[PDB]
From a paper:
The tertiary structure of PAD6 is typical of the PAD family and consists of two consecutive immunoglobulin-like domains (IgG1 and IgG2) followed by a α/β propeller C-terminal domain. Examination of the PAD6 crystal packing showed that PAD6 adopts a nearly identical dimeric arrangement across the crystal packing, with a buried surface of 1986.5 Å2 at the interface [Fig. S3(a)]. PAD1–3 bind calcium at equivalent sites to PAD4 except PAD1, which lacks the binding site for Ca5. The sequence examination shows that many of the acidic (seven Asp or Glu) and polar (one Asn) residues involved in the Ca2+ coordination in PAD4 are not conserved in PAD6 [Fig. 3(a)]. However, Ala676 is flanked by two cysteines (Cys675 and Cys677) that could potentially act as active residues. 4(b) and 4(c)]. Additionally, in this structure, Arg347 shields access to the catalytic centre formed by Asp351, His471 and Asp473 by occupying the substrate-binding cleft. In our structure, a PEG molecule from the crystallization solution was found in the vicinity of Cys675 and Cys677 [Fig. S5(c)], suggesting that this conformation is not rigid, and the putative active site can be accessed by a potential substrate.
The human peptidylarginine deiminase type VI (PAD6) is essential in oocyte and embryonic development as a component of the supramolecular assemblies called cytoplasmic lattices. PAD6 is the most recently characterized member of the PAD family and is specifically expressed in oocytes. The crystal structure presented here suggests PAD6 assembles as a dimer resembling other PADs, albeit with compromised abilities to bind Ca2+ and substrates.
Author numbering:
A (entry chain A), B (entry chain A): 8 to 62, 73 to 106, 112 to 169, 177 to 226, 231 to 283, 285 to 445, 449 to 491, 497 to 595, ...
């Protein structure tokens, strides 16, 4: 008999000639051919064979099976043997073996190189955690792709994951078969596989899910380079598997058959967002022909903070403040490479040009993410997200922090199912839903800010209208009720921005303003509870920041004076919006209050003088920034979501 | 001051009057108002207040917080109090409390009744396993729905899950608020909530995701009845949450605000498929005007097995064998109720009538599942599924077995992404992909069958052409080479079914038939390996069944003689297709062989005489059956997928 299978029925008469793929086990039926007078048996194998008898003689039970496996490939056909000798009160059975290797290997232990997997079945599984395993694939974020044969540079080839195919066996056995490297039609739309000729040929991708390789000689060693196309999403878990099938070429009436298949599994790394507690590397600035105020002060602050400034062009096809509202700096990481990128959720239709590519420093990626709602003040954009610092909550670690999404509480505007599903599909920053649709912009950054400390490693700052009323009341009692909110601002600057200079006395007697702020205070308190619960915070982690709001067009909250919470956080250097509060002998009481709260904790407060920038209405153009920061040192794959 | 929040800043001057929702905690800032001369303090609360000072006097630290909570609702406003007395080398601060209850409760401990949850935050989580928690919801499978105010019978109301809402507090506090029972727009499409007036009003559902309730008096107690619409799928995880928001009615210029929200989570039970090792309860039979053969023998076998027979009408709008190929008996289970149902994946377009409803015994549900591919021999149907018995594999338990799906191995036909995703979304029967597209029907039941034993509790039978060649060779050597395959069958019965009577000598000399069977044997061996690996089977669990195949129109395998593996499994009673093998002195050697293999294990073999039924071509009409069985005793929620 001639065979390629997991079960072999030995025959006293004809010895079996079989193929053994290395890493697999064959079950040997020893008793089916045994003579009736046989009571016991002995079994012996050659050097490359490992025989297991239920883990020397053995009693002959009703079923008697032995398992065999091979340790190295055969240098010729039938070079290995297993012999069974039947003892009674009488027969021999023989199996000739030829061992071949057919294996696909990846960086399964996440060490930065392809390593041989210890087990053919364990290698199809992807296990999270430090005691886990499973290779990682990175999405191609090359900004050129935004809007068959390719040249790939040594700088770009490190982004790709290796997948090695090894086949070893006698030439006369291997020539009977063909190899097919493949994946399912659906998985092929999610990644590309390249083969170097440097010049690389596309062997698998969205239009090709099977690739044939000829077996010429006694060994084939080929390395393929793989890249993902998309991050995990509602429709995509992140898992992609590749297989090599050994196909027996046929007689035209009998179809071909697959005799063996080896499979590897990749997990496409998630898109990870970065909180403002991470060290700034670069500050991207969309100036919109501005210099004095925001642009100059933020340029100065950035130099003071060991950070680069990258100019950003205006995009005439987008609403103003797009650099902040439609984009986020994030990263994606593999054992062999970390790719920082900007994730863009454009609100405009049919875009042709992408001016943000001029600013992107070498190696910085660019990815687009679709959304559904594109109106002014839409919360369906990546700007409607804030990242917490790393926290432990109820004994559960969130080493990369948790993503915070602005949402609604009235049973209004919201993030689309598409963008929300994309976020939850990343897994490693378990999203928390906050309440922000009471704010005109819908952005939580108008009432909260995390700042790093040199303990949890951070403090949460929260907007507090009650704290501001308390501060103004104390000043009034001290005889400063005549001090003026919006002092040192030009009358037309106030009028053109919907504001009016008011004394502390007029502000404290304004019952409508007080009711607007009481409403805002209730909305912030709802969020304070969710943040304490979901981030494991205690009140010692929170600092109240005096901040007034007003309701504009139900109506929505807007900062009354420039929002102190809208900080540019650069380590210990804080770029705080200059609020223009009531002055008490040449000093703004709001600047003095916030400096008294933050300076003793090691913070350097720089007040950004730019009233028009901070009072810009939603949709209107203004200078803005987006800071690119150091990715977390904690490796995402070692987390157990 | 007047408040409803998680943080209260005490004031030496004005005492605070606050609302405390039961089950929540308030943080009290004790140090912010403390006099400069104060060095230590004492705190005292009344009977309903629980005070925690970092878990009698206490030192006055820079931040000094105390947490308070309430144990029962207040019978009047300010009926509870907390007093802080400041000691120096000097002041008092007071908080008046009013406790209210606002809670949604479900059968969170899966005990069959609504129980009070121990924690407001833990109740939003759904944890798998015996030490888990989380209420369960059942899909409405009423066959009437196949194709605002409702009457629900005491028999049908047990299918629904209870959700109780309790609100308790002073009438003068509760009258300030409104209650809103709600869920997101997307979740509302997945379930219906009813309120009894018995006659039940639909309060939440696909067209209504918010329902308002008036707070009249000092307490509200309402029970709602919930039912799911759909099983988990590609787009639906199975989790649905409901909330009650306490809304403060507004001054028209200030929008309303939500002061508190309580939330419960349900998991819609998965659709669980049943293996043929479970005890038969009812046999559904589509006779198609037939009596002698299949219909009579299966009716007899069913009576012999303590099972009911339910006649099924012919469906002229569907391909033949639809009762078996387009339907599956499955179940869905909650702590309070188990619903057995038939899951239908119709292959026809625009169906109006559903004759299977006439057969459905009282209480048996009916659900439809969409598919994409509707051609003849399509593997995109629920008939392309077999369920394994419960198994343990590599230390992992599959107490409900694993679903087995027929698929392809040539890198052909396949299950659609829609049906496959529906199956994997159930979670509790971790699907295994087998190779069956080499078979004309694409059904794994043509080469494998599980039978229960009175140890794993089962045996796997596998089709084996090699075993059949071996049996025929032994008969030839004994002088019976003249024995005839298809003996005792009429010549026209053979001709009209594409077969011809052949002696054992002619069969063993047929080289084309041998090559067709060698091909089939390689395909079955691929599946034997996957089954051993994925189900943790050893060769002692497998019995080879002699069975020949032939290739017909690449070409596809069909059973050559009636397929012995296509058994009607009724406990120890097996309805085996009568194969009409070569007879050796009045006995079919195939019947004798299978009886020698199965009878010593306690099986009673009944050979179903019906050649035309077992040789029916795909798409053609024939009598067939579908057996409804006992659901597993193991509760699905106690598994950790
Ligand atoms: Cl996953
Ligand atoms: Cl889930």
């Amino acid at each position: 008999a001639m065979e390629f299978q997991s079960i072999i029925h030995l025959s006293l008469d004809s010895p079996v000639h079989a193929v053994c793929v290395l890493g697999t086990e064959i079950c040997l039926d020893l008793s089916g051919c045994a003579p009736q007078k046989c009571q016991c048996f002995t079994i012996h194998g050659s050097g490359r064979v490992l025989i297991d008898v239920a883990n020397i003689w053995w009693p002959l039970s009703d079923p008697t099976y032995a398992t065999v496996k091979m340790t190295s490939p055969s240098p010729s056909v039938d070079a290995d043997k297993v012999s069974v000798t039947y003892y009674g009160p009488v027969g021999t059975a023989v199996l000739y073996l030829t061992g071949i290797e057919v294996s696909l290997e990846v960086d399964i232990y996440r060490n930065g190189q392809v390593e041989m997997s210890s087990d053919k079945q364990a290698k199809k599984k992807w296990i999270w955690g430090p005691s886990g395993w499973g290779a990682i694939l990175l999405v191609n974020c090359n900004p050129a792709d935004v809007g068959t044969k390719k040249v790939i540079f040594s700088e770009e080839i490190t982004n790709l994951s290796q997948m090695t195919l090894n086949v070893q066996g006698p030439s006369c056995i291997l020539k009977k078969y063909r190899l097919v490297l493949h994946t399912s039609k659906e998985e092929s739309k999610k990644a590309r596989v390249y083969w170097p000729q440097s010049t690389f040929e596309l062997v698998l991708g969205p239009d090709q899910h099977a690739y044939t390789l000829a077996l010429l000689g006694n060994h084939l060693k080929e390395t393929f380079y793989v890249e993902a196309i998309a991050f995990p999403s509602a429709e995509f878990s992140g898992l992609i598997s590749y297989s090599v099938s050994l196909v027996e070429e046929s007689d035209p009436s009998i179809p071909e058959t697959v005799l063996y298949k080896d499979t590897v599994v990749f997990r496409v790394a998630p898109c990870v967002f970065i909180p403002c507690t991470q060290v700034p590397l670069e500050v991207y600035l969309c100036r919109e022909l501005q210099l004095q105020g925001f642009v100059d002060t933020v340029t100065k602050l950035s130099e003071k903070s060991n950070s680069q400034v990258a100019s950003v062009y205006e995009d005439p096809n987008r609403l103003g403040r797009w650099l902040q509202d439609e984009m986020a700096f994030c990263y994606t990481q593999a054992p062999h490479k970390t790719t920082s990128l900007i994730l863009d959720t454009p609100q405009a239709a049919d875009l042709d040009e992408f001016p943000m590519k001029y600013s992107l420093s070498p190696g910085i990626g660019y990815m687009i993410q679709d959304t559904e709602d594109h109106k002014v003040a839409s919360m369906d954009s990546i700007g409607n997200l804030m990242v917490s610092p790393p926290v432990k909550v109820q004994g559960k670690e969130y080493p990369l922090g948790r993503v915070l999404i602005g949402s609604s509480f009235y049973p209004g505007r919201a993030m689309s199912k598409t963008l929300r599903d994309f976020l939850y599909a990343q897994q490693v920053q378990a999203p928390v839903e906050l309440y922000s649709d009471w704010l005109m912009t819908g952005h939580v950054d108008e009432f909260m800010c995390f700042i790093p400390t040199d303990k949890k490693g951070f403090l949460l700052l929260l907007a507090s209208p009650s704290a501001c009323y308390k501060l103004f009341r104390e000043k009034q009692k001290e005889g400063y009720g005549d001090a003026l909110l919006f002092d040192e601002l030009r009358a037309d600057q106030l009028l053109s921005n919907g504001r009016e200079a008011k004394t502390i006395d007029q502000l404290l007697a304004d019952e409508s303003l007080k009711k607007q702020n009481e409403y805002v205070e209730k909305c912030i308190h709802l969020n304070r509870d969710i943040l304490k619960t979901e981030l494991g915070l205690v009140e010692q982690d929170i600092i109240e920041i005096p901040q007034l709001f007003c309701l504009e067009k139900r109506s929505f909250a807007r900062p009354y004076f420039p929002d102190l919470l809208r900080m540019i956080v650069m380590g210990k250097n804080l770029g705080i919006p200059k609020p223009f509060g009531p002055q008490i002998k040449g000093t703004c009481c709001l600047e003095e209050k916030i400096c008294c709260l933050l300076e003793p904790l090691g913070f350097k407060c720089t007040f950004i003088n730019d009233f028009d920038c901070y009072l810009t209405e939603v949709g209107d153009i203004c200078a803005c920034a987006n800071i690119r920061r150091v990715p977390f040192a904690f490796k995402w794959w070692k987390m157990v979501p």
